[PDB]
Amino acid sequence: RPEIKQAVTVRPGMCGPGSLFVGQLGDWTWETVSAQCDTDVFAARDASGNPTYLAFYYFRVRGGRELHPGSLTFGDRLTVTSGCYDQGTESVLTLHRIDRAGSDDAQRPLDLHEFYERPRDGSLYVENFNRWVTRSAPGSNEDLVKSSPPGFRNDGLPQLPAAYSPRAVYREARTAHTFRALDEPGFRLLPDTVEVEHPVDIVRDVNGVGLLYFASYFSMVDKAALALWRRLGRSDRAFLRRVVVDQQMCYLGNADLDSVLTLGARVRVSTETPGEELVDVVISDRDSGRVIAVSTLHTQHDA
Amino acid sequence: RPEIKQAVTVRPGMCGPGSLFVGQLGDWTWETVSAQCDTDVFAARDASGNPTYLAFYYFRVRGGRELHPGSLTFGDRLTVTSGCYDQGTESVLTLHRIDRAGSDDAQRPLDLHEFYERPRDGSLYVENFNRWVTRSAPGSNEDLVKSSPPGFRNDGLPQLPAAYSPRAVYREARTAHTFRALDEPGFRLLPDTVEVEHPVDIVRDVNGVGLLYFASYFSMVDKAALALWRRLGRSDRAFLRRVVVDQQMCYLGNADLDSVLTLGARVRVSTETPGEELVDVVISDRDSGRVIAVSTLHTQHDA
C-alpha cells in the first residue's frame, strides 16, 4: 500500500550511454511489485512449480532538457518514488518518479495527472507495464503463455482512470510502428533509413533465465539509431551528446537465442525546432514473421 | 572498520552470461571503500576539484563447480561479506565473499588464508585491487595520472602479509600474457587461436564519465572466448553451459572511444581432466602500441 521512497547515489552500474539505467529501473519495478503485491517476483512459480516471469511489455522514460538519462553521472544524489497500479491479475503497472535529491517538492507522492498530462521539466517519469508469462516449452522463447503466480495481490493497489491507458498506447504502436502518429504536424520524414541484421548476442543480449533481456532491447534500438546517425554523416561524439527527452518501447515478443533479428530505423526532423527529431525503430524476427519490438525516441541534438 | 554483511536476492540486473554480475561486484567495491575509508568514492575530487575515479586494476572471481557465476538465477538468496585491506594512499584492495544464504558457516568473517590459500568449493571469492586516477587531458582516456582524493582514510584498514600480493600477481600477468604459467604441468596448448578486431562500442562499452567501463572488459574477453569456441567447432548452447571456476583480469590501460581494439585468444586443454581448459585473452590498442588488458579463464565444459 505505501509508495516506496529511496535516496539513490548514481553508481557506475546504473548510468552512461548503454542500457544500465533501464536495467536498474526494471529491477526497481520487480522490488516494488514484490513489496506491494505480497509476491516474491524474483522467485515466482505457478501452481505446478513452473517459473513465471514478470515480463516487460510497455516501457516509457520521459524527461526533458533539465533532467534526462544522459544527465546522470557518478555520485549524483536522486530521490526515487515508486508504486503500483491495478491492471488485474495477469498484469501490473509500476510508476517511478526520479528527482534530484535537493529539488523543491521532491517529497511529493505519485500523481497520475502529473505523469499522464502535466510532466515537469526537471523530473524523470517511468512507466513499466508488465505481464506474467511462462514458457510454452522448455528452452523455447516463442509463444509465451499468460500466467499469474498463486497469491498475487492486485486487490490492494490504486486504480487508473479510463483516460490513462498504457494498453491503448501500446495497441496503437503495434499498428503504426511508432508512438508518434505519422500525421503529427511539425515534422518531416527524411528519406534515409537503415535495416541492420543483428544475430542475438549470447554474451550481451541474454538474461539469467535464457530469455532476451528487456534492457538489451534498448541497446538494440540504440545500435539501429547509431547506424542511422552514421548514415546521415553525423559524428560519434555528437551521438554521445544526444538528449533523449522521451522514449517508449513495446515488447511484442521474445526470441530464441539462435535468432537473427532485423533492426529497422527511420527519422522525422522538426520543421519548427532545429535539432528536434523522432526516431522510430522496429525489431523483426523475419524467420518467424514477428515484429518483436517497436520504439520511438524523441531527441534534441546539436549536429 | 566493521566488515559489511548484506542479504542479497539475485536480480535480473546482476546475473546471466553477460557482465552484469561483475558490474554489481564493482558497485559493491565502491560502496565498501566509501564506508570504510570515509570518502564518497562516487563523487570523489582532488584538491583542484578534478574528478578522481577509483579505477579497477586487478580483478579475480574464484568459484568452483558448487557455486560459480553461471549458478546464479533469479531469486537465489545470497550472503555477501565485504571489507577493505590497506594498499597505501593511492590503491586499496576490496574482498567480497559470496555464499548461498542457507549454507553452514555463511556468517563467518573474511579470512585471508581462506581467500589466498584454502578457498572452499561452494563459496565465491572476489578480489578488487583499485587505483585512484585522473585524466591527464579532458576527453583523453590515455596516460591516466595517479591520484588520491583528500581525506582518503586507509589508516583504519587491516594489513595483508607479504605472501598475499595482488601486485605480484598482476606484474607476472603483464609479462607472461597469462595468470597461469605456460610451463604449468598437465596442459597442452591447442594450435587454434583467434584475433578479433573490436571497434569500441559507444552504445555498450562506455561508462557514465566517458571511459571504457570495467565490466565491458569482461564482455570483450567473452567475445574473444566465443570466437575461439566457434573456431573449434563448438555450439552456442555449449558456450552457455561453460563453468568458469576462476577468472583473473588485469586492466593495464583505458582507451579513447574511437579506438579499434584487438582481442587475441588461445587455449590450453587438460591432459588429466576431460573438459578442463585455460583460456588466455589479451586486449591490444595497436595504434598506441599498448596492451590494455590480460585475462585468464579456468573452465570446465561438456563439448
Coordinates of C-alpha atoms in Angstrom, one line a residue:
Chain A
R1 CA 0.0 0.0 0.0
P2 CA 2.6 2.7 0.9
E3 CA 4.7 4.1 -2.0
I4 CA 8.4 3.3 -1.8
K5 CA 10.8 6.3 -1.4
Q6 CA 14.6 5.8 -1.8
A7 CA 17.6 8.1 -1.7
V8 CA 19.9 6.9 -4.5
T9 CA 23.5 7.8 -5.3
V10 CA 24.2 7.3 -9.0
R11 CA 26.6 4.3 -9.4
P12 CA 28.6 3.2 -12.5
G13 CA 26.2 0.2 -12.7
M14 CA 23.1 2.4 -13.4
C15 CA 24.2 5.2 -15.9
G16 CA 26.0 6.0 -19.1
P17 CA 25.1 5.6 -22.8
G18 CA 24.3 1.9 -22.5
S19 CA 21.2 0.2 -21.0
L20 CA 22.3 0.2 -17.3
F21 CA 19.8 2.8 -16.2
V22 CA 16.9 1.0 -17.8
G23 CA 18.3 -2.2 -16.2
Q24 CA 18.1 -0.5 -12.7
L25 CA 14.6 0.8 -13.4
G26 CA 13.4 -2.8 -14.2
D27 CA 15.0 -4.2 -11.0
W28 CA 13.2 -1.4 -9.0
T29 CA 9.9 -2.5 -10.7
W30 CA 10.4 -6.1 -9.6
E31 CA 11.2 -4.9 -6.0
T32 CA 8.1 -2.5 -5.9
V33 CA 5.7 -5.2 -7.2
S34 CA 7.2 -7.7 -4.6
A35 CA 6.6 -5.2 -1.7
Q36 CA 3.1 -4.1 -2.8
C37 CA 1.6 -7.5 -4.2
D38 CA 2.9 -9.8 -1.4
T39 CA 4.7 -12.0 -4.0
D40 CA 8.4 -12.7 -4.4
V41 CA 8.6 -11.7 -8.1
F42 CA 12.3 -12.8 -8.2
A43 CA 11.4 -16.5 -7.4
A44 CA 7.8 -16.7 -8.7
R45 CA 6.2 -20.0 -9.7
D46 CA 2.7 -21.1 -10.9
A47 CA 0.7 -24.0 -9.2
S48 CA 2.7 -26.8 -11.0
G49 CA 6.0 -25.1 -9.8
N50 CA 6.9 -23.7 -13.4
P51 CA 8.8 -20.5 -13.1
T52 CA 6.8 -17.4 -14.0
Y53 CA 8.5 -14.1 -15.1
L54 CA 7.0 -10.6 -14.7
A55 CA 7.9 -9.8 -18.3
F56 CA 8.2 -6.2 -19.6
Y57 CA 5.5 -5.2 -22.1
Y58 CA 5.3 -1.4 -22.3
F59 CA 8.1 0.9 -21.0
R60 CA 8.3 4.8 -21.0
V61 CA 11.1 7.1 -19.8
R62 CA 10.1 10.7 -20.1
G63 CA 12.5 13.5 -19.1
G64 CA 13.4 16.8 -20.6
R65 CA 16.4 19.1 -21.1
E66 CA 16.7 19.8 -17.3
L67 CA 16.8 16.0 -16.4
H68 CA 17.2 13.2 -18.9
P69 CA 19.1 9.8 -18.6
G70 CA 22.3 11.3 -20.1
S71 CA 22.3 14.0 -17.3
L72 CA 23.1 11.3 -14.7
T73 CA 26.8 11.0 -13.6
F74 CA 28.6 9.2 -10.9
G75 CA 27.7 10.4 -7.4
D76 CA 24.6 12.4 -8.3
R77 CA 22.1 12.3 -5.5
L78 CA 18.5 11.3 -6.5
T79 CA 15.0 10.8 -4.9
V80 CA 13.0 7.8 -6.3
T81 CA 9.3 7.4 -5.6
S82 CA 7.7 4.1 -6.8
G83 CA 4.2 2.5 -6.7
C84 CA 2.0 0.0 -8.5
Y85 CA -1.5 0.5 -10.1
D86 CA -4.1 -2.3 -10.6
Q87 CA -4.2 -3.8 -14.1
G88 CA -5.9 -7.0 -12.9
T89 CA -4.3 -10.4 -12.0
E90 CA -2.1 -11.0 -15.2
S91 CA -0.5 -7.5 -15.5
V92 CA 0.5 -4.6 -13.3
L93 CA 1.6 -1.0 -13.9
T94 CA 4.6 0.3 -11.9
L95 CA 5.5 4.0 -11.9
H96 CA 8.8 5.6 -10.8
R97 CA 9.5 9.3 -10.4
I98 CA 13.1 10.5 -10.2
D99 CA 14.0 13.9 -8.9
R100 CA 17.4 15.5 -8.0
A101 CA 17.5 14.9 -4.1
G102 CA 17.8 18.8 -3.5
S103 CA 14.9 20.0 -5.7
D104 CA 11.9 21.9 -4.3
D105 CA 9.0 19.4 -3.9
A106 CA 10.9 16.1 -4.3
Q107 CA 9.0 14.6 -1.3
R108 CA 5.6 14.8 -3.2
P109 CA 3.8 11.5 -3.7
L110 CA 3.0 9.9 -7.1
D111 CA 0.4 12.0 -9.1
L112 CA -1.2 10.3 -12.1
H113 CA -2.2 13.7 -13.6
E114 CA 1.4 14.9 -13.3
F115 CA 2.6 11.6 -15.1
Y116 CA 0.0 11.4 -17.8
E117 CA -1.0 15.2 -18.5
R118 CA 1.5 17.7 -16.8
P119 CA 5.0 16.2 -16.6
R120 CA 7.6 18.7 -15.2
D121 CA 10.9 19.5 -16.9
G122 CA 13.4 18.5 -14.2
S123 CA 11.8 15.2 -13.1
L124 CA 12.1 11.8 -14.8
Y125 CA 8.8 9.8 -15.3
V126 CA 9.0 6.0 -15.7
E127 CA 6.1 3.6 -16.6
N128 CA 6.6 -0.1 -16.6
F129 CA 3.6 -2.2 -17.7
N130 CA 4.5 -5.9 -17.0
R131 CA 2.7 -9.2 -17.7
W132 CA 3.2 -12.6 -16.0
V133 CA 4.5 -15.2 -18.6
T134 CA 5.6 -18.9 -18.6
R135 CA 7.4 -20.8 -21.4
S136 CA 5.1 -23.0 -23.6
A137 CA 8.1 -25.5 -24.0
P138 CA 11.4 -25.7 -22.1
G139 CA 14.3 -23.8 -23.9
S140 CA 11.7 -22.1 -26.3
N141 CA 11.4 -18.3 -26.1
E142 CA 8.5 -18.1 -28.6
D143 CA 4.7 -18.4 -27.8
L144 CA 4.9 -17.4 -24.1
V145 CA 1.8 -18.2 -22.1
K146 CA -0.1 -15.7 -19.8
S147 CA 0.2 -16.6 -16.2
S148 CA -0.4 -15.3 -12.6
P149 CA 1.5 -16.7 -9.6
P150 CA -0.8 -18.0 -6.9
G151 CA -1.3 -15.3 -4.1
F152 CA -0.6 -12.3 -6.4
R153 CA -2.3 -9.4 -4.6
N154 CA -3.5 -6.7 -7.0
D155 CA -6.6 -6.1 -4.7
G156 CA -4.5 -3.6 -2.6
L157 CA -3.5 -1.3 -5.4
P158 CA -4.8 2.1 -6.6
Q159 CA -6.8 2.4 -9.8
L160 CA -6.1 4.3 -13.1
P161 CA -9.0 6.3 -14.6
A162 CA -10.1 5.2 -18.2
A163 CA -8.2 8.2 -19.7
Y164 CA -4.7 6.8 -18.6
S165 CA -4.3 3.6 -20.6
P166 CA -0.9 2.0 -21.2
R167 CA -2.9 -0.7 -23.1
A168 CA -4.3 1.8 -25.7
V169 CA -0.8 3.3 -26.1
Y170 CA 0.9 0.0 -26.9
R171 CA -2.0 -1.2 -29.2
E172 CA -1.5 2.0 -31.4
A173 CA 2.3 1.4 -31.5
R174 CA 1.9 -2.3 -32.7
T175 CA -0.4 -1.0 -35.5
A176 CA 1.5 2.2 -36.5
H177 CA 5.2 1.1 -35.8
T178 CA 5.5 4.4 -33.9
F179 CA 4.3 6.0 -30.7
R180 CA 4.0 9.4 -32.5
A181 CA 1.4 9.4 -35.3
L182 CA 2.9 9.9 -38.8
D183 CA 0.3 12.7 -39.4
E184 CA 1.5 14.7 -36.3
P185 CA 2.1 18.2 -37.6
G186 CA 5.5 20.0 -37.4
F187 CA 7.8 17.1 -38.6
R188 CA 9.2 15.9 -42.0
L189 CA 10.3 12.3 -42.7
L190 CA 13.9 12.1 -44.0
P191 CA 14.3 9.7 -46.9
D192 CA 17.4 8.0 -45.2
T193 CA 16.6 4.7 -43.4
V194 CA 18.6 1.7 -42.2
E195 CA 18.0 -2.0 -41.8
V196 CA 20.7 -3.8 -39.7
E197 CA 21.0 -7.6 -39.4
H198 CA 21.6 -8.4 -35.7
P199 CA 22.3 -12.0 -34.6
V200 CA 21.3 -12.5 -31.0
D201 CA 24.5 -11.7 -28.9
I202 CA 24.7 -14.6 -26.4
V203 CA 27.4 -12.7 -24.4
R204 CA 25.3 -9.4 -24.1
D205 CA 21.5 -9.8 -25.0
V206 CA 20.6 -12.8 -22.8
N207 CA 19.3 -12.9 -19.2
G208 CA 19.8 -15.3 -16.2
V209 CA 16.8 -17.5 -17.4
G210 CA 17.8 -17.7 -21.1
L211 CA 15.4 -15.1 -22.5
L212 CA 16.3 -11.9 -24.4
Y213 CA 16.9 -9.4 -21.5
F214 CA 14.5 -6.4 -21.5
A215 CA 17.3 -3.9 -21.2
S216 CA 19.1 -5.3 -24.3
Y217 CA 16.1 -4.2 -26.4
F218 CA 17.1 -0.6 -25.6
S219 CA 20.7 -1.5 -26.6
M220 CA 19.5 -3.0 -30.0
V221 CA 17.3 0.2 -30.5
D222 CA 20.4 2.5 -30.0
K223 CA 22.5 0.2 -32.3
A224 CA 19.8 0.9 -35.0
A225 CA 19.7 4.7 -34.1
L226 CA 23.5 4.9 -34.3
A227 CA 23.5 3.1 -37.7
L228 CA 21.1 5.8 -39.0
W229 CA 23.0 8.7 -37.3
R230 CA 26.2 7.5 -39.2
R231 CA 24.2 7.1 -42.4
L232 CA 23.3 10.8 -42.1
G233 CA 27.1 11.7 -41.8
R234 CA 26.9 12.6 -38.0
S235 CA 29.8 12.1 -35.5
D236 CA 30.2 9.6 -32.6
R237 CA 30.9 12.5 -30.2
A238 CA 27.6 14.1 -31.4
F239 CA 25.7 10.7 -30.8
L240 CA 27.1 10.7 -27.2
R241 CA 25.7 14.3 -26.7
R242 CA 22.1 13.4 -27.8
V243 CA 19.4 14.4 -25.3
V244 CA 16.6 11.8 -25.3
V245 CA 13.6 13.7 -23.7
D246 CA 11.1 10.8 -24.2
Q247 CA 11.4 7.1 -25.2
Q248 CA 8.6 4.4 -25.5
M249 CA 9.2 0.7 -26.0
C250 CA 6.6 -2.1 -26.7
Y251 CA 7.9 -5.7 -26.3
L252 CA 5.6 -7.8 -28.6
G253 CA 7.8 -10.9 -28.3
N254 CA 11.0 -12.6 -27.1
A255 CA 13.2 -14.7 -29.4
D256 CA 15.2 -17.9 -29.4
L257 CA 18.9 -17.4 -28.8
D258 CA 19.9 -18.6 -32.4
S259 CA 17.6 -15.9 -34.0
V260 CA 18.8 -13.3 -36.5
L261 CA 16.9 -10.1 -35.8
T262 CA 16.4 -7.1 -38.1
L263 CA 16.6 -3.6 -36.7
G264 CA 14.8 -1.0 -39.0
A265 CA 15.1 2.7 -38.3
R266 CA 13.6 6.0 -39.7
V267 CA 13.7 9.6 -38.6
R268 CA 11.4 12.7 -38.7
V269 CA 13.0 16.2 -38.2
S270 CA 11.2 19.2 -36.7
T271 CA 10.1 21.9 -39.2
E272 CA 9.7 24.2 -36.0
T273 CA 12.7 23.4 -33.6
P274 CA 16.2 22.9 -35.0
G275 CA 17.8 19.6 -33.8
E276 CA 14.5 18.0 -32.6
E277 CA 13.8 14.6 -34.2
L278 CA 11.6 11.5 -33.7
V279 CA 13.4 8.2 -34.4
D280 CA 11.3 5.0 -34.8
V281 CA 12.9 1.6 -34.5
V282 CA 11.2 -1.8 -35.3
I283 CA 12.8 -5.1 -34.3
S284 CA 11.7 -8.0 -36.5
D285 CA 12.3 -11.8 -36.4
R286 CA 12.0 -12.4 -40.1
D287 CA 12.2 -16.3 -39.8
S288 CA 9.0 -16.4 -37.6
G289 CA 7.3 -13.5 -39.3
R290 CA 7.0 -11.5 -36.0
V291 CA 7.6 -7.9 -35.0
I292 CA 9.1 -8.4 -31.5
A293 CA 9.5 -4.7 -30.5
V294 CA 8.7 -1.1 -31.5
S295 CA 10.4 2.0 -30.0
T296 CA 10.1 5.8 -30.5
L297 CA 12.8 8.3 -29.3
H298 CA 12.1 12.0 -29.1
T299 CA 15.5 13.7 -29.2
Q300 CA 17.2 17.1 -29.2
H301 CA 20.8 17.2 -30.7
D302 CA 23.5 19.7 -31.9
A303 CA 24.7 18.3 -35.4
Chain B
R1 CA 36.4 -0.8 10.4
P2 CA 33.5 -3.4 10.6
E3 CA 33.1 -5.7 7.5
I4 CA 29.8 -5.2 5.6
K5 CA 27.3 -8.1 5.6
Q6 CA 24.4 -8.0 3.1
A7 CA 21.5 -10.4 2.4
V8 CA 21.1 -10.2 -1.5
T9 CA 18.3 -11.7 -3.7
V10 CA 19.6 -12.3 -7.2
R11 CA 18.0 -9.7 -9.6
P12 CA 18.0 -9.7 -13.4
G13 CA 20.4 -6.7 -13.3
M14 CA 23.2 -8.8 -11.6
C15 CA 23.4 -12.3 -13.3
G16 CA 23.3 -14.1 -16.7
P17 CA 26.0 -14.8 -19.3
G18 CA 26.9 -11.1 -19.7
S19 CA 28.9 -8.8 -17.4
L20 CA 26.1 -7.7 -15.0
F21 CA 27.4 -9.8 -12.1
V22 CA 30.9 -8.2 -12.4
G23 CA 29.2 -4.8 -12.7
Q24 CA 27.4 -5.4 -9.4
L25 CA 30.6 -6.6 -7.7
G26 CA 32.4 -3.3 -8.8
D27 CA 29.5 -1.1 -7.4
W28 CA 29.8 -3.1 -4.1
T29 CA 33.6 -2.3 -4.1
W30 CA 32.9 1.4 -4.4
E31 CA 30.2 1.2 -1.6
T32 CA 32.6 -0.7 0.7
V33 CA 35.6 1.6 0.2
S34 CA 33.2 4.6 0.7
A35 CA 32.0 3.2 4.1
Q36 CA 35.5 2.1 5.3
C37 CA 37.7 5.0 4.0
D38 CA 35.4 7.9 4.9
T39 CA 35.3 9.1 1.3
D40 CA 32.4 9.4 -1.2
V41 CA 34.0 7.3 -4.0
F42 CA 31.1 8.1 -6.3
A43 CA 31.7 11.9 -6.2
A44 CA 35.5 12.0 -5.4
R45 CA 37.6 15.0 -6.4
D46 CA 41.3 16.0 -5.9
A47 CA 42.4 19.4 -4.4
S48 CA 41.8 21.4 -7.6
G49 CA 38.3 19.8 -7.9
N50 CA 39.2 17.5 -10.8
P51 CA 37.1 14.2 -10.7
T52 CA 39.1 11.2 -9.5
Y53 CA 37.9 7.7 -10.2
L54 CA 38.7 4.5 -8.2
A55 CA 39.7 2.6 -11.3
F56 CA 39.8 -1.2 -11.5
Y57 CA 43.4 -2.6 -11.9
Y58 CA 43.2 -6.3 -10.8
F59 CA 40.0 -8.4 -10.6
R60 CA 39.6 -12.1 -9.6
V61 CA 36.4 -14.1 -9.3
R62 CA 37.1 -17.6 -8.0
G63 CA 34.3 -20.2 -7.6
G64 CA 34.0 -23.9 -8.4
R65 CA 31.6 -26.5 -9.6
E66 CA 29.3 -26.0 -6.5
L67 CA 29.0 -22.2 -6.9
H68 CA 30.2 -20.2 -10.0
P69 CA 28.7 -17.1 -11.6
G70 CA 26.6 -19.2 -14.0
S71 CA 25.0 -20.9 -11.0
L72 CA 23.2 -17.7 -10.1
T73 CA 19.5 -17.4 -11.2
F74 CA 16.6 -15.0 -10.4
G75 CA 15.5 -15.1 -6.8
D76 CA 18.6 -17.0 -5.3
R77 CA 19.3 -15.9 -1.8
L78 CA 22.9 -15.0 -1.1
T79 CA 25.1 -13.7 1.8
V80 CA 27.8 -11.1 0.8
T81 CA 30.7 -10.2 3.2
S82 CA 32.9 -7.3 2.1
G83 CA 35.9 -5.4 3.5
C84 CA 39.0 -3.4 2.5
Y85 CA 42.7 -4.0 3.1
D86 CA 45.4 -1.3 3.2
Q87 CA 47.4 -0.9 0.0
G88 CA 48.6 2.7 0.9
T89 CA 47.0 6.0 -0.2
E90 CA 46.8 5.5 -4.0
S91 CA 45.3 2.0 -4.1
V92 CA 43.0 -0.3 -2.0
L93 CA 42.2 -4.0 -2.1
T94 CA 38.5 -4.9 -1.5
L95 CA 37.4 -8.5 -0.9
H96 CA 33.9 -10.0 -1.3
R97 CA 32.8 -13.5 -0.2
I98 CA 29.5 -14.8 -1.6
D99 CA 27.8 -17.8 0.0
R100 CA 24.3 -19.2 -0.5
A101 CA 22.2 -17.7 2.4
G102 CA 21.4 -21.1 3.9
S103 CA 24.9 -22.7 3.8
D104 CA 26.6 -23.9 7.1
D105 CA 29.1 -21.1 8.2
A106 CA 27.9 -18.2 6.0
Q107 CA 28.1 -15.8 8.9
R108 CA 32.0 -16.3 9.2
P109 CA 34.1 -13.1 8.7
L110 CA 36.7 -12.5 5.9
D111 CA 39.7 -14.9 6.2
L112 CA 42.8 -14.0 4.1
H113 CA 44.1 -17.6 4.4
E114 CA 40.7 -18.9 3.1
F115 CA 40.9 -16.4 0.1
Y116 CA 44.6 -16.8 -0.8
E117 CA 45.4 -20.5 0.2
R118 CA 42.2 -22.6 1.1
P119 CA 39.2 -21.5 -1.0
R120 CA 36.1 -23.6 -0.4
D121 CA 34.1 -25.2 -3.3
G122 CA 30.6 -23.6 -2.7
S123 CA 31.8 -20.0 -1.9
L124 CA 32.6 -17.3 -4.4
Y125 CA 35.8 -15.2 -3.7
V126 CA 36.2 -11.7 -5.3
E127 CA 39.3 -9.5 -5.2
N128 CA 39.2 -6.0 -6.5
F129 CA 42.5 -4.1 -6.5
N130 CA 41.7 -0.5 -7.4
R131 CA 43.8 2.6 -8.0
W132 CA 42.8 6.3 -7.9
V133 CA 43.2 8.1 -11.3
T134 CA 42.5 11.4 -13.0
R135 CA 42.6 12.3 -16.8
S136 CA 45.9 13.9 -18.0
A137 CA 43.7 15.9 -20.5
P138 CA 39.9 16.4 -20.7
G139 CA 38.3 13.9 -23.2
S140 CA 41.6 11.8 -23.3
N141 CA 41.4 8.2 -21.9
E142 CA 45.2 7.6 -22.3
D143 CA 48.0 8.3 -19.9
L144 CA 45.8 8.5 -16.7
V145 CA 47.6 10.0 -13.7
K146 CA 47.8 8.5 -10.2
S147 CA 45.7 10.4 -7.6
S148 CA 44.4 10.2 -4.1
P149 CA 41.3 12.2 -3.0
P150 CA 42.0 14.5 0.0
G151 CA 40.9 12.7 3.3
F152 CA 41.1 9.2 1.9
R153 CA 41.4 7.1 5.1
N154 CA 43.5 3.9 4.5
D155 CA 44.9 4.2 8.1
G156 CA 41.8 2.3 9.6
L157 CA 42.2 -0.9 7.4
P158 CA 43.7 -4.3 8.1
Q159 CA 47.0 -5.4 6.5
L160 CA 47.9 -8.1 4.1
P161 CA 51.0 -10.2 4.9
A162 CA 53.8 -10.2 2.3
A163 CA 52.8 -13.6 0.9
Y164 CA 49.4 -12.3 -0.4
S165 CA 50.3 -9.8 -3.1
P166 CA 47.8 -8.7 -5.8
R167 CA 50.6 -6.6 -7.1
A168 CA 53.0 -9.5 -7.7
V169 CA 50.1 -11.4 -9.4
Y170 CA 49.3 -8.6 -11.9
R171 CA 53.1 -7.9 -12.6
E172 CA 53.5 -11.6 -13.7
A173 CA 50.4 -11.4 -16.0
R174 CA 51.6 -8.2 -17.7
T175 CA 54.9 -10.0 -18.5
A176 CA 53.5 -13.5 -19.4
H177 CA 50.1 -12.6 -21.0
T178 CA 48.5 -15.2 -18.7
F179 CA 47.9 -15.7 -15.0
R180 CA 48.7 -19.5 -15.3
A181 CA 52.4 -20.0 -16.3
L182 CA 52.8 -21.7 -19.7
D183 CA 55.2 -24.3 -18.1
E184 CA 52.4 -25.4 -15.6
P185 CA 52.2 -29.2 -15.9
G186 CA 49.1 -31.0 -17.0
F187 CA 48.0 -28.8 -20.0
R188 CA 48.6 -28.8 -23.8
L189 CA 48.3 -25.7 -25.9
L190 CA 45.9 -26.1 -28.9
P191 CA 47.2 -24.7 -32.2
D192 CA 43.9 -22.8 -32.9
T193 CA 43.9 -19.1 -31.9
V194 CA 41.8 -16.1 -32.8
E195 CA 42.5 -12.3 -33.3
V196 CA 39.2 -10.3 -33.4
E197 CA 39.1 -6.6 -34.4
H198 CA 36.7 -4.8 -32.0
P199 CA 35.9 -1.1 -32.5
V200 CA 34.9 0.5 -29.2
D201 CA 31.1 0.1 -28.9
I202 CA 29.9 3.5 -27.8
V203 CA 26.4 2.0 -27.0
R204 CA 27.8 -0.9 -24.8
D205 CA 31.5 -0.4 -23.7
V206 CA 31.3 3.2 -22.3
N207 CA 30.6 4.4 -18.7
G208 CA 28.9 7.5 -17.3
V209 CA 32.2 9.5 -17.3
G210 CA 33.2 8.6 -20.9
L211 CA 35.9 5.9 -20.0
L212 CA 35.8 2.2 -21.1
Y213 CA 33.6 0.6 -18.4
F214 CA 35.5 -2.0 -16.3
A215 CA 32.6 -4.6 -16.8
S216 CA 32.8 -4.3 -20.6
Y217 CA 36.4 -5.7 -20.5
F218 CA 34.8 -8.9 -19.3
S219 CA 32.3 -8.7 -22.2
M220 CA 35.2 -8.2 -24.7
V221 CA 37.1 -11.2 -23.2
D222 CA 34.0 -13.4 -23.6
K223 CA 33.5 -12.1 -27.2
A224 CA 37.2 -13.4 -27.9
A225 CA 36.5 -16.6 -26.0
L226 CA 33.3 -17.3 -28.0
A227 CA 35.2 -16.5 -31.3
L228 CA 37.7 -19.3 -30.3
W229 CA 34.9 -21.7 -29.2
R230 CA 33.3 -21.3 -32.6
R231 CA 36.7 -21.7 -34.3
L232 CA 37.0 -25.1 -32.5
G233 CA 33.5 -26.2 -33.9
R234 CA 31.7 -26.0 -30.6
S235 CA 28.0 -25.0 -30.2
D236 CA 26.4 -21.7 -28.7
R237 CA 24.3 -23.9 -26.3
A238 CA 27.6 -25.5 -25.1
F239 CA 29.2 -22.0 -24.6
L240 CA 26.2 -21.1 -22.4
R241 CA 26.8 -24.2 -20.3
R242 CA 30.5 -23.4 -19.6
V243 CA 31.5 -23.4 -15.9
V244 CA 34.1 -20.7 -15.2
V245 CA 35.7 -21.8 -11.9
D246 CA 38.3 -19.0 -11.9
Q247 CA 38.9 -15.7 -13.8
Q248 CA 41.6 -13.1 -13.4
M249 CA 41.7 -9.7 -15.2
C250 CA 44.5 -7.0 -15.3
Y251 CA 43.5 -3.6 -16.6
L252 CA 46.7 -2.0 -17.9
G253 CA 45.0 0.9 -19.7
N254 CA 41.8 2.5 -20.8
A255 CA 41.2 3.7 -24.4
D256 CA 39.8 6.6 -26.4
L257 CA 36.2 6.0 -27.7
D258 CA 37.3 6.0 -31.4
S259 CA 39.9 3.2 -30.8
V260 CA 39.9 -0.1 -32.7
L261 CA 41.0 -2.8 -30.2
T262 CA 42.3 -6.3 -30.9
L263 CA 41.2 -9.3 -28.9
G264 CA 43.6 -12.2 -29.1
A265 CA 42.7 -15.6 -27.6
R266 CA 44.5 -19.0 -27.1
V267 CA 43.6 -22.2 -25.2
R268 CA 45.3 -25.0 -23.2
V269 CA 43.4 -28.3 -22.6
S270 CA 43.9 -30.5 -19.6
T271 CA 45.9 -33.8 -20.3
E272 CA 44.4 -35.0 -16.9
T273 CA 40.7 -33.9 -16.6
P274 CA 38.5 -34.1 -19.7
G275 CA 36.7 -30.7 -20.5
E276 CA 39.1 -28.6 -18.3
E277 CA 40.8 -25.7 -20.2
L278 CA 42.7 -22.4 -19.6
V279 CA 41.8 -19.6 -22.0
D280 CA 44.0 -16.5 -22.2
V281 CA 42.8 -13.3 -23.8
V282 CA 44.9 -10.2 -24.5
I283 CA 43.3 -6.9 -25.4
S284 CA 45.6 -4.6 -27.5
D285 CA 45.4 -1.0 -28.7
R286 CA 47.6 -1.4 -31.8
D287 CA 47.5 2.3 -32.8
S288 CA 49.1 3.4 -29.4
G289 CA 51.2 0.2 -29.1
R290 CA 49.6 -0.7 -25.7
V291 CA 48.4 -4.0 -24.1
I292 CA 45.4 -2.6 -22.2
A293 CA 44.1 -5.9 -20.6
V294 CA 45.1 -9.5 -19.9
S295 CA 42.6 -12.2 -18.7
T296 CA 42.8 -15.9 -17.9
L297 CA 39.7 -18.1 -17.5
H298 CA 39.8 -21.6 -15.9
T299 CA 36.9 -23.5 -17.3
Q300 CA 35.1 -26.9 -17.2
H301 CA 32.8 -27.7 -20.2
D302 CA 30.9 -30.7 -21.8
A303 CA 31.7 -30.5 -25.6

